[PDB]
Structure formats: C-alpha cells, structure tokens
Design an enzyme around this catalytic site. Structure first.
Site, mmCIF file in Angstrom:
data_model
loop_
_atom_site.group_PDB
_atom_site.id
_atom_site.type_symbol
_atom_site.label_atom_id
_atom_site.label_comp_id
_atom_site.label_asym_id
_atom_site.label_seq_id
_atom_site.Cartn_x
_atom_site.Cartn_y
_atom_site.Cartn_z
ATOM 1 N N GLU A 170 -53.544 -15.954 3.356
ATOM 2 C CA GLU A 170 -52.837 -16.770 4.330
ATOM 3 C C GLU A 170 -53.080 -18.262 4.105
ATOM 4 O OE1 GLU A 170 -53.551 -15.609 8.373
ATOM 5 O OE2 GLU A 170 -52.611 -13.647 8.137
ATOM 6 N N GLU A 357 -52.412 -6.878 6.265
ATOM 7 C CA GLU A 357 -52.864 -6.887 7.651
ATOM 8 C C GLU A 357 -51.726 -6.502 8.584
ATOM 9 O OE1 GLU A 357 -54.766 -10.503 8.929
ATOM 10 O OE2 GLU A 357 -55.769 -10.762 6.957
#
Lengths: 452, 452, 444, 444
Positions: A170, A357
């Site tokens: 991320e 995720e």
C-alpha cells in the site's frame, strides 16, 4: 475478459491465507538489538495515536510465535502473509545484519513449513528504519539502494524456504498518509513535487528489490496497492466503462491514493500522462532507464480491498445510502468491490491477482459464554468471497485470498480501538480466543469455498 | 560588571552597521547555477507565505549590488552584515563549487573594501541547500560535516578580505520555527528528541565551522542568538536576579527559543542540566567530545534583539500594558531590552557582544512629497540605542550595532508585508528611497552616537 | 429478582423517529433548522422523514405488543401540538399522540411521556429560547396543555430529558441544536431557566389526575476500583462532584437543585457579568416533590482509590458509536443516586449502537447488543438485590433512528429499520428482550 | 472646491470611548458581556473604562473646538438610556447626552447622532435580539425616545452604522458580539428585521422637528484599473454585485432595500427552511425616503477591465490593522454610490490605524495618517469637482479607542490616549486636519 465458467469455482491450488504486519503484532520493539523504526518514534509522539497507544508490545507475537502458528494450523490456513521488520534484521537499515532478528523469522518460517503453510513475505509494511529516516527517508536519492540491500539480505537468508514475496504494501497509504496527510509515520505534509519524488524512489526501490529477489531460488513476486473499487451503477456497458475510467483516473491534484499512479509504472512502465507536464519546483527527473527499472516483470498483483464507492453512469461518486451497513472503523460494506476491483485490475493489466487483504473491523468482545461472536464479520466475509468467486467465473485469474487479520492488532493511528482479527486478543493477558469467523473461514478452506 | 561610567559613550572603534540576509534581498533564485534552497521550495507551497509571496526576485540585490553599495557608503555605514547563499556557492550543498556564485560575493566584498566598509559575513541565515534537505537536513549525522565543508569553501575564497564571520543566525528560529512550530522552512513539527538532535547537529556544525575559519587568515568569529530579554520590575537586586534567572531558564517543554539552551553549549561547553535527564525515544547521544567540539573559542556573542518582556519580582511574565507602543509586525516597543539583554549576556558569558540585529517593522509609504517618513523607526532606534549606551556605561563590552535592515525585504512567512528597512523598496520598480531613519542613522554614525 | 410490577420498557424520542416534520400544521423546531445547516450532521442527514413513525404508528405499536413490552417511553413534539410554542394549540398534533396513547392502552402498555426531548419550537428559539426570562412560563403553558389533553390517560411524565446534553451540547460545545457556544454565565442562566421550567411543569402536571413525575439525567457513573469502602467513597465523591470549569455534564449540577433544592456551593460564589440571580424562591420552585429519578446510563468510568479517573483499558469492548462497555455502570449509577437522593430510580435509557445489517439469511444478528443488555441487566438486578429501589428499565431504542449529529450512522434499535423501504425487522436482541420480560428477568 | 456648508467632522462610537459601563443605571449591552468572554478580544481587552469619555466630556469637547471641528458624529448607548432596551427611560443616561449636545451647540458644533453603533442592550439579546419578530418595534421605541429627548437640538441622525459588520461579524463569522455563526436564512431574517427597524426609526424621527436622516454602510469601493469606460463599468458592476454565498458584507444587499425598495434578484430564489417572508409592505416600510447615504470607506480593491478583483500589489502601503491604503476608494465609492442612488453622500467614517506612540520629544507624530488623510481627501475633492453631492467628511476617530475584537491594539485617533493616565495628546494629524478645516481644504 474471457469467462472461465462457474463449474470449478475456486482453483484447486488457491491460497486461502491470513495476513498480518510486523509492527502491528510483533512487539519487542526495543529488544534483541532491533533498531528503531519510524512507528516506534511516531507512536510515542503525543496525540498521534488513539489514546497514545503504541506497538511496543502489541500482540507480543515475537514471544508467542509458537501459539500463533498453532492457531494457523488449527484453522487450516494454506498461506500466512506477514511482514519482515527491516529494522529487526538491519538495525541501521543498511550494513550490519542482526542475527537475533534473522533467527526470529527463521523460527517463524520453519514453524510454517513444519505445518505445511506457504509463507507470503511482505518486505515493506511501513516500518521504515529510523536511521534511514534521519537521512531523509524516501526523499533521499539513495533510498532505492537502501531497499535493494535489504531485499538482498531477505533473499540471502529466506530465499531457500520462501517462494512468495511482496515488495511494498500500500504505497498509496504509507506515502499518502505518511507524507501528504500526515496521519501516519513519519507524519509529514509535503508538497506535490516531494510526493512525486518519494513515489519515484519507492517505485525504483521496487525494481531493484525485484532484481534482488530474482537472484537464486525461483519465486513469485508481487506489489500490493490499496484499492477502492468504483462500483458501476448497472451492468450497462457505458456504466461499467465510466466506472473503469474513474477507477483508473488520476491528476496532479489527486493521484497518491489512486491505483493508476502506482500500478501503471510497475506494470506498464509509464506514469499517468499528466506527470510529464508537471514543472513544480523540485520535481524529480524521471528517465526512461527509471521506468524500465520500475517495471521489472512480477508474477502477481496484490489488492487490498475493504470497500469501494458506488459511481453513477458518468463516473461521479454516488451519495451513500442512508444507514448503509458499515464496520467498526466507519467504512461502508460494499460486497461488489471484491468483484469489480479484481475485474478492472485484470482487464487493465492482464495479471494474476491475489487479494492480499480483505477484512472488517468489528466491536468484538468476550461474551458471557466466554466466546467471541462476530456474525457481522462472517456475513461480510461470506458476501465478499461470493463476489470474488463471481470474478473468477468471469475469467479473473485470482490465485489467493488473505483475511485481514489473523489477530486483533495495533491498527496504526486508531491504536487498538479497531479489531480486524479472526482471533481475539485480550491485551491484558495476551490471551488468544478464536472468533466464530475463524471457524467459519476454516470450513470455507476445507470445502475450498464450494459451499459459499 | 565593572562600570566605566557615562563620559566616554560608545567606543572609538564601534562597528556601526546594517544587516541583511541572502534569501531576503538577493533574488536571482534560479540563475547562474545556483541550486535550490528550502525557502525556494517552501515559499512556493500554497498557503505557507503571506499572499504566496516568495524570494524569487525579492529586492533583486543580485543585479543591483552597485546601487546598494552606494547606499551603504552614502549613509557612512562602518560595517555591512550579510549572509552568503550556501546554495549559490555549493548548489548540491557539498562537492562542486559554483564560481559564478563566488564571483557575486567577491564583487560584493571588493565593492565594500573599496568603500572602506567592514564585511560581517553570516554563513547560515536559514537557506539550507535543498539537496541536503533531501538527505534529511539537520537530522542527518553528517550535517555537521556538510557545514564544515561549506565553511572551508567560505574561508578559501573569502578569508583574504573578510575578517568577521557569524556561523549561524538565530538557531532558536530556524530550528524552532523550521522544525517545531513549522511556520518556517522546511515547515516541520517534529518531536522533542528530533529538535534536540537537530540542535546538537547544528551546534557541532558550528564547532567544525569555527575550526575551518581558524585555518589561514586571522578573523573574529561569532554566533548569533534570537534573544527576548527579561526586563526586571525594578532596580532592586532581587528583582534583577529574578529577571536574570528567568532569562537564562529552560526546560524540556520550553527550550528551543531560549538563550541558555544554545549559548551554554557554545560558550560554557555544557547543555542545561535537564537535557542529560531526558530519555525520549531516539534522543541523540551527547558525548564529552561533542561538547568540546561545540565550544570552540569564539570572539563575540551576537544578539538579535527587537523587544523583551517585563517580569514581576518573581520572574513571572507581567501582563502587557494596554495600548503599549508596538510595531507593524505587532511586536511591542521595549527600549530596556537593549540594556538588560546585553547586560545579562555580558554577566553570564563575559564575552564581547555585538547587536547583530535591531530594528522595527513600520507601515511605511511614499508620501505625496515623494519621501519616506518613518519617525516611529527613528524614535525606536533612538530609545534602544540610549539603552545600549547605558549598558556600555555600566561595563558591557559592546563592539557593534547592526540595524535591521538596510532594505525593505522579504520577511519570511510575512512576505513583503513587513518593512524593516532604513531604505524603502518599491517592488514594482525596484526603486530604492532612503527613509528619514537612514539619514538619522547617518548622523548617529558621524557623531559616534555622542548626541543621543 | 425484579419486582412484580417492574416497568420493562423501550424508549424513543419524537424527532428521532417521527418524520412528518412539515405536515398537519406542525411548527418548526430547532432540529429542523439545525439539521438542514450543511456540515452540522453526519452526511447532512436530517429527521425530515426519519422512521416515518408518524405514519406507521400502527405497525410500531404491533411491534411493542409482539415484544410484550410493559411500558413505552416516548416524547411529545412540542412544536407539533403548539406550532408557535405557545398560544394556538394544534388539534391535529394532539390527535396523533391521542391515537398513540389509545393504541398503547388497547395493548395494555403503560405510557411514559417525555415532555421535552430537545425539539424546542423554532418560534421560541427566535425569541432567545432558554435565555429568555419567559422561557419557564413557555414550558409551563406547554406542561398545562399536556396535562389537559393527556392527563386522563397518562400517569408517567418526564419533564426534561438529559439537560446535560441539550444545554451542554446545544449551547456550550455547540454540536447539538441550536449549535451555540455560550459563556458560563449564560449556561447557568439557561440551566436556571430549565430548572425553574421543570418546577412549573411539575405544578401543572399535579393539577388533575394523580401521576408519577420524573426528571431524566444523562449519567456517567463512577465505578469504584474495588469493593473497598474507601474506593466506593472516592467514586461517590467523584460522581457527585462539579465545579465552575466542569459542571454542565455532571449529575449533581442538575439533580441537587431538583431534589435537594440547592445548587453546588460554587454556583453562588460566581459573579461573572450577566450571571442570573438565584433566589430562595427559585430553589423552592425548582425543588417540587417528584416521584422518581430517571437515569440514562450507557457507560461509566473507572476511578482509582483517590477518585481519579483511570485510563480506558487497551482494546476495551466498545460500541459502534465509540463508547466503552462498562457493565458495572448500571449497578453503581442507581446505587449512588439512590443513596444520595433516596428516591425510586428509573433507567429511562440503556442500549448500544451496533454495526447492524441484514445478513444473507435475511435476519439482523446483534449478539453484541444481547451481551451488552444481558451484562448491564445483571448489574441492575444486583443493585435491586442490594436494596436499590428501581421501578423500571427502558431499552434504547425500539427502532434504529436518527442519532442527532451522527444521523442514521448509529443504530441503537432492537428493531432494524431499512430506511429505503421503512421496513422494520426485529433483531435477535428484540427476541432476547421479549424473553427477559416474559420471565421478569428471572433467567438472567 | 469643497462647499461652504461642508460638514468637516470627526466620529466616535459609544462603547469605543465612553466607558462607565456599569453605572448610573446603565443596562448591560452585548459588548459588555462578549468582551468579558475568554479569548474573544485581543489580550482580553474590554470597554469597561475605554477612554473614560463619560467622565471627561468637557476635556474632549474642548479638544473638538480646539481642532475647529464643524460636526461631531457620535453614537448613543441604547442601554444607557433604556437599560432594558424598552420601557423605563434612564434620565441619568439622557442627561449625559443632553450635556454632550449642549456642549456641542455651545461651541457651535453640529451634532451627528448615530442611534445604533452595535451596542444592543443585553436584555434584548436575551429575548433573541434581531431574530425576534419584535426587534423592529424595540428599535422604533428607541428611535421615539431619541426624537423625544434630542429632537429639539439634533438635526442629523444615522439609524444604523455598518449593518455589514454588526450582522456579518456579529452573526455570520462570529468575531463580533454576540459572537454567533448562523445559517444564511437567519442572516437574511436578521437583515430584514434590521432594515424594517430602520424604516420604523425613520418614521419616528420624522415626527416633530424637520431633520436629516441617513443610513451608514461599510463600503469597499471597486477602483477601476483605468479611466476607460469598460474598466469603469466593470468596477461599478462588481461594486454592486452580490449573491447568496457572498452578500452580507456587500453594499447592494443593504442599500437596494433602503433606497430602491428591492432586494437583489438572488434573494427571490432562496427557499431554505426558516427563510423570512418578505412582504411588499415590509419593502415599502424599509424604503422610507432618507436625506443622505453614509459611507464608511477605509480602503478599496482594484478591478481589471473584466471586472475581476486584482491581486494586492506586493508591498502596497498598509495600515497598523493590516488594511491597504487605496486613495482612489474615496473617489469611486462616493461617485458610484451617487450614480446608483442619486442621494447626497456623507463620508461618515474615514481614517487609518497607525502604530502611534509618544516620541522622546513628548509628541505623537503620525505622518502616515497625515499622508493617508491628504491622499484620500484629494480624491474626495476630485469627486466633488466631477459633480458628486458630498455633504461632509468625518475623520475616524477623535480619540484612540477600543477597536472591537482588536482591543486597544489599533489606534485610529487624531488624538492619542494614554490608557495608564487617560491623558489626551493631539497628534500632528489633529493639527493637520485643523488647518484643512480652516482653509476648507483649498490648500490640499
């Protein structure tokens, strides 16, 4: 996309996983010669975290490794996604290796292989070594080389037994929140040009790391983005198209949290066109050699998807429904995000996708019966996995799904006030209690999701 | 202090000066191979400066040197205090010297010596080279070495004709406003430990710079602090003592803007005691050798004094009188600051003092008569110089006084909205008009302040 | 166990459920205006429509009786019955509440009527609202209308709901309507007008039928570190403390006037410009005899052995609105209030915000709400065991509703409301509660 | 040149100079309370004492005549004459102003009385101030009391000073008393009530002696870049433009209702909840004939040929309060206003905040204020030359005073005031102005 058909459902070799991150679970932040990271310093700064929580102890996973491995086996998880603490293995970020640090991850990886669980190793999940921060962090021209040195050490010590690596988790968040909004470590609010400079250095770092991970034993390398899928207003072709365009759009006033800004350089070897015309003071020089380095061949795209945004026919963001189902952290539940996200990403880049995720924050507690009932998480998981199965039917190559998280943990600026685990952690005792969702997920894996 | 009495007045060799700083006047920010500095970048960030003013052009002093030198000599100024742009002579901050940059300062110094005016050169007046900022600036362990290398270049090229050096101007402000409050470049809001780390690196830089300035020609070397003198409630011994203690106090929650925090290291080779007790995360390691490096012998203390604060008999801050005389920037007029500030500094450190800045922001304009009348500036200067004269009478060794500023100029985050000049600048035409205060000051210099 | 005649209830408020804000000659209230001011409410939500309970009274009444609730706490929209706040009564407004009360009595459910649940008529707000010297008289007139048209059928009244909140949030912090941030002296003026208003409303409610009259505080109980005598005393003193810099949200600032006929000592010693004149007669007017104390308890705070608030435990069980779950609050709150004021306690609100949704099975599973209720009710039952007189417990809320500045983002209902269709779906908690009532809490 | 009967004056306001805030039966006003609220005013300054002009009337009158002033503009304290805002008249309050007016007439100084200069009686504030439907009547009553006791000796009246500021800053931005931040509809409501209040005040001031009645606006004139017709017309349009997002500080929003009997177009299209009903009766009432338009002009803004506001010049001459010096403001402001409304203009305020002090020579030198005044007055002269009907110019202010949220940090006076001793020292600007009056501005 070219459909595959429903019959098979989830692939036979589908990586049913769970994910964690070093700072969020490990604790032992100042032990065994580990160097400071930016979150150790940031979290100890007054007002930065919910109720001044910090990850000093967290889930004390460093000392309770054995117990957590037993939970993974018990649940029947196929893959465990975790991050390596750069500062634990390289206290100064470069140079001297810390053997006590290596030993810990060695013991973890042996514990995983002993239980037949496939390691998925995130190299960078936000815990930049503080020593490197003192040298300007990702602003420094040498930051790619720092990361390369780290990658080399990773491959050297873990290239034998680990065959799945993710370079960056991320960049949207750790650069955007770390350096633009200032809510995450190191907590800066930098001008656009510096955001581009940091991005550029993170992406070049990615390249060099890929190269380092290619030397020696073969393995699958990934890059994980925070994705917020645009969900089309209907199945009409124009509406889908508008959602696709909005999803992959970016501009100089709104790029750092987008998909395109990061994934285009990695996968297509080019930034969004607008970048070439920016002339701001201090803009980094972006060269052709840079873009080849950035776009080293990688094996899968990692998507962190929690929810998306409903868009209209023209790609504008639709107003949220009144009393829309939501989670404990405030985010809306939008099941279709785990269809449209993987779909659009597959259409654009034609790469295998792993959901690195997917999970939900819930107001979990221990009920009077001594258990942790999290039906809301079960429904969330059930709903989202259906959409991902639909995406696979419509011909998206999805190789894995990783539940966030194995444990309740330190949720960054929100401290311990958000519980994402399939396992509950009482921080007073460090007791683990497997939640209802844990058993629910266990059954899914055993049936390979056939009964969803 | 041993008095000398009020017969003699100001010494015979008193350095009557005026002061400027590179970024505030020079302009030519992107020419002649000059590298970026943090203010170039900071001032171009939306919302950082009053009405987004910047020092791109400033007073265009780079191109109008000859006119400015002529103003200096026309006023009879004995000494001219200026700063060198680090980024102009070392565009990357280290390595390659830029000879066109050198040539500018060379032509300035020659211009000065030709007019019999004594150069007082400030090395660092806040314009850190951007390239070094990208390497973490003053957080970086090597920042002392960077400065040393700069100082060597200074000595090499200017050691012949320049005999007065100031290493750092107002670390209180460039660290405090630059890195704690974040109102000045580079605009950060860092934890306590990083402020101490920066302070320590700045102080070590000073040490190394002194050593470089000692190699070759003999010179006088100083260090300039921002000082807010505590003015005692009365002449009673205990009221004075209370003011002294307040003036030299500091603690972990209030130190960066204080005198003792900076001057104790430089002059006495010790931090205030509270520093050694702090153990915050990532505090720098302060060694005996560091303190010996920091405390090289210097020749004078620089005080930048604009105003002070009135204290009660216990040293607590008195409430500001209703409708107190103030300045255009909003600060109060407190004449006694230029008595008590020098006196207390003289008593504590027993070093010669130079007032390296004193002056006032006025709402100046060109009147219908084509002139710039600034009687408020005249009165300010008259009152403060009276007080400095009294300090000299009471035994304070004061070697010079530099009026801030020669020119209206770029006043940092306030942009061009604050005029401190004894010379008015019309920024549309770059026209200089000497203000009444310029002629008033001319008369003072010619009479050595005998008629105050 | 629980007394034989225990008022097992559920609670709502007019603005949070009714909707129909601009119909049948209903006058504007401050929330109509406040909610429509951009940025004041989560995602600019408002109670224009809310749960549309105005129009679905029948359906909601059937839910009440299906759950077997003994009592229904609700509030009357002051602006619905008196559109200008005074003068001309609106009979179409009265009809609605008449129809509701009939519906309640037809199902054998005891009405518990809150007069003021924050929806001050806008016309009165334009006259300065609670800063106006006449504000107590405005309320009195309203309390007289209430007794007139409803005193025949209703014998449980609550004058004010949570003065802590509608004054503190409404005029100190400014997060609630009308959204002001007023000086201390004006806060006290407002408080004094509200408390005098209560007195006059008690007198109005005493004319005619016998009835039980109450006053409801937002209470945040101090939970002792342990059962040691000194820890209990420290908690008690903290619980009933207040001072000039922190009073508006405390229990003692409001209840001491109402029940003991005196403010905290510090109140009299203030002489800020514009402070109201507090007389002996005021305090006699304020301290009319009332029949019960209403406690709205959601959670409390743990105190050390010296009365200092402890830091919240790391990862403490919490609700969807962010509040901690502190079961012992529904023990110590009643017990301390009982000890101090020696009046019967009514838990006029208790409940939990959950991230509820409709699952794949079409139901609404709220096991967290069930655990919350179970835990808290155990505590209340222990307070009763230890001799605390508690006459009733009202679950907040019957329906998911408009949660003020949080809009519809917080669901406190035992019944789920889908706002797209206004469909009610009873949550697991509703059936849990049904069962608790049927057994009078003997199986807790 | 300047007309023969030109009203060369100076101006003050009650709260800014008077002090004596809590004596001789004077009621509280909003500024009494606001200024005592923590952090509302620069360094918690207030007007409790101010310049103590109440107790030093003779000295200040002596300065007025010493300067050779032709007219003195002041405001009457509503709360000093009507301590509750309505009802009982306070004759000690009346006496003071009777004494003032006597002292003016005695010295041959034309009184110019501002009725409302922001000091709303606190009692009326408690009743909702300008939100209350009765606020125009409160002001009408006040205006009747003014005419009754002062109609004999005063022939110049200004109903309202700067509605832009007391409504915009008082109720939108919240920086001025009472300190509110209200929605658009409540701002329009307040505007309407103020404007209606104005209308009723004119009618009250007409009953009896004939007099000149004006209305004073805070004006920010648009200065055309050049004298080209295109630039001029663009400046005019911008100067009188307004919209629902930006109206309260504009000229047109207030002056059109007063002088043209209409609000700007956009006002038609607001349907927000709580919007006031603007009747044709309201508009006719508001738009009573008046004798002059008062302009308070300190500075303007330059507009390009397109009409777009130009950026402020780098290093533009400015004042101690931060505002720019824009001499041409006092040409285009009058002229454009005069062209639009065909009314006589009175510059009811013009001056400059300067960082003034007592020099070592014991004098107060303010050459910047002198230059400011000279530059602006030349521009006003040129407007009169070009045929603009300007009836007078009042220098703000006679004394350094309490400058609202900026406390005593901004000195606008032609007389310095040392707040330690209350000593007055006439600044060089006083003497400069004296000379201008004696020569009638012929030497400018």
């Amino acid at each position: 996309l070219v459909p595959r058909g429903s019959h098979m459902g989830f692939p036979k070799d589908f990586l049913w996983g769970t994910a964690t991150a070093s700072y969020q679970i490990e604790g032992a932040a100042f032990e065994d010669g580990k160097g400071l990271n930016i979150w150790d310093v940031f979290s100890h700064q007054e007002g930065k975290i919910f109720e001044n929580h910090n990850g000093d102890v967290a889930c004390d996973h460093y000392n309770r490794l054995e117990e957590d491995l037993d939970i993974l086996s018990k649940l029947g998880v196929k893959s465990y996604r975790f991050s390596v603490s750069w500062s634990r293995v390289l206290p100064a970020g470069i140079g001297q290796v810390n053997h006590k640090g290596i030993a810990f991850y060695q013991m973890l990886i042996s514990g995983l292989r002993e239980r037949g669980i496939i390691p998925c190793m995130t190299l960078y999940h936000w815990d930049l070594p503080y020593a490197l921060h003192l040298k300007g962090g990702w602003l420094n021209d040498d930051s790619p080389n720092w990361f390369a040195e780290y990658a080399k050490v990773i491959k050297t010590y873990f290239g034998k037994e680990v065959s799945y690596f993710i370079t960056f988790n991320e960049p949207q968040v750790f650069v955007g929140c770390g350096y633009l909004s200032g809510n995450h470590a190191p907590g800066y609010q930098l001008p656009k040009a510096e955001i581009v400079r940091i991005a550029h250095n993170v992406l070049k770092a990615h390249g060099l790391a890929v190269k380092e991970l290619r030397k020696g034993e073969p393995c699958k390398i990934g890059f994980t983005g925070a994705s917020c899928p645009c969900i089309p207003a209907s199945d009409r072709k124009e509406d889908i198209e508008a959602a696709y365009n909005q999803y992959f759009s970016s501009n100089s006033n709104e790029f750092v949290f987008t998909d395109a800004f990061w994934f285009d350089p990695v996968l297509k070897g080019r930034y969004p066109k607008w970048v070439t015309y920016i002339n701001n003071v201090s803009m980094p020089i972006i060269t052709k050699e840079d873009m080849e380095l950035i776009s080293q061949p990688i094996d899968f795209v990692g998507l962190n998807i929690y929810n998306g945004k409903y868009v209209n026919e023209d790609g504008g963001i639709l107003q949220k429904k009144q009393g829309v189902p939501r989670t404990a952290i405030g985010w809306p539940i939008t099941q279709e995000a785990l269809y449209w996200g993987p779909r659009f990403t597959s259409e654009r880049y034609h790469k295998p996708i792993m959901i690195t995720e997917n999970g939900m924050s819930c107001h979990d507690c221990i009920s009077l019966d001594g258990k942790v009932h999290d039906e809301n998480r079960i429904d969330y998981m059930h709903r989202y996995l259906l959409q991902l199965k639909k995406a696979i039917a419509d011909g998206v190559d999805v190789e894995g799904y990783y539940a966030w998280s194995l444990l309740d943990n330190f949720e960054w600026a929100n401290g311990y006030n958000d519980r994402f685990g399939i396992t509950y952690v009482d921080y007073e005792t460090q007791q683990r209690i497997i939640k209802d969702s844990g058993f629910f997920y266990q059954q899914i894996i055993e049936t390979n999701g056939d009964l969803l």
